[PDB]
C-alpha cells in the first residue's frame, strides 16, 4: 500500500533540576528506525532498524547536530511559552511536534503535515495547503504572526514536499527486505464463561505486520460492531502487532457467531469459529 516517514519530538522541562529532556523518534510505516535521546553525556542520533546501518557515517554526525540544535530551540520555545501563557517558573511542561510525508506504492508524494503541542493540547498546525497556520488560541496567535512575517511555511512546505520525500524513498529501498513485507495474523478464538447463561467469545490476531487490521464479529452475517469490545492494537515488541475483539453471547449459540479477519497479509479474509 502507501508508505510514510513520521517523526515525533518531545521536550519536557524539569525546573530546578537542570535542562529539559528531549527525545526524537522516527518511523517508516510501522517500523521505528532512528532515535535521539538527550539524556546522555554525549547524545547521538542512533539507528533502531538494522537496515539503517547502510547509511554513510557522515549521516549520523549530521543528524546528531540537527537534533542538538533543535533541542536548543525547544528550550527557548518552552521558556517562551511561559511568557505567552503567563505561567510560573515552578512547574514542568511539555512541548511537542509531529510531522511527516506520505507516498503511494508507486512512490508519489500526496500528503504532508506539521503540528505543535503545548502541555498536550493543540498549539499551532500547518494547514493542508502547507502554506498557512491554524493557531489554536490567542497565545499561539503570537506565534502565527511571527511565522507569517518570516514566511516559515515555505521552508516547511519545501521540506515536506521534497527532502522528506527523497529520503523516505531511499529508506524504503534500503530496507526492502522487510519493509515491503506483510506477515499475516495468526488467529484463534477463546472461550470464557461470562455468566450463568452468557459466555464471552474472544477473537485473537497475533504476529502481524503492518498494524492495520479488521477484526469483526458477525452473527449469521450481520456485524456486532456495537456489541463488540476491541482492545487497542498493541505491539508484540518484535516488530509485530496484536489485537483482539470480543463478543458476549447467549449460551449455546456459539455456532451463530463468526469472526472475519482482513489483513494485507491475508490472500483472502480468514474466517474463524470457536
Amino acid at each position: 500500500g502507501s508508505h510514510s516517514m513520521r517523526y515525533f519530538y518531545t521536550s519536557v522541562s524539569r525546573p530546578g533540576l537542570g535542562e529539559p529532556r528531549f527525545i526524537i523518534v522516527g518511523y517508516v510505516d510501522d517500523t521505528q528506525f532512528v532515535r535521539f535521546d538527550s539524556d546522555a553525556a554525549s547524545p547521538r542520533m542512533e539507528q533502531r532498524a538494522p537496515w539503517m546501518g547502510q547509511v554513510e557515517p557522515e549521516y549520523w554526525d549530521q543528524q546528531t547536530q540537527i537534533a542538538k540544535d533543535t533541542a536548543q530551540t525547544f528550550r527557548v520555545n518552552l521558556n517562551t511559552a511561559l511568557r505567552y501563557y503567563n505561567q510560573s517558573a515552578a512547574g514542568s511542561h511539555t512541548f511537542q511536534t509531529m510531522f511527516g510525508c506520505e507516498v503511494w506504492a508507486d512512490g508519489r508524494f500526496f500528503h504532508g503535515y506539521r503540528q505543535y503541542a503545548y502541555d498536550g493540547a493543540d498549539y499551532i498546525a500547518l494547514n493542508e495547503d502547507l502554506r498557512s497556520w491554524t493557531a489554536a488560541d490567542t497565545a499561539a496567535q503570537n506565534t502565527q504572526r511571527k511565522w507569517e512575517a518570516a514566511g516559515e511555511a515555505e521552508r516547511h512546505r519545501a521540506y515536506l514536499e521534497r527532502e522528506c520525500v527523497e529520503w523516505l524513498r531511499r529508506y524504503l529501498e534500503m530496507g526492502k527486505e522487510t519493509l515491503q513485507r506483510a506477515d499475516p495474523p495468526k488467529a484463534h478464538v477463546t472461550h470464557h464463561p461470562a455468566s450463568d447463561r452468557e459466555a464471552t467469545l474472544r477473537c485473537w490476531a497475533l504476529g502481524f505486520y503492518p498494524a492495520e487490521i479488521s477484526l469483526t464479529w458477525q452473527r449469521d452475517g450481520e456485524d456486532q460492531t456495537q456489541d463488540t469490545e476491541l482492545v487497542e492494537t498493541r505491539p508484540g515488541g518484535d516488530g509485530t502487532f496484536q489485537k483482539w475483539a470480543a463478543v458476549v453471547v447467549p449460551s449455546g449459540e456459539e455456532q451463530r457467531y463468526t469472526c472475519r479477519v482482513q489483513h494485507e497479509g491475508l490472500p483472502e479474509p480468514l474466517t474463524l469459529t470457536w
Partner: peptide, 9 residues
Amino acid sequence: FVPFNSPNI
C-alpha cells in the same frame, strides 16, 4: 532525515 530548519515560537 530530520529538517535542519527549526523555528522559534
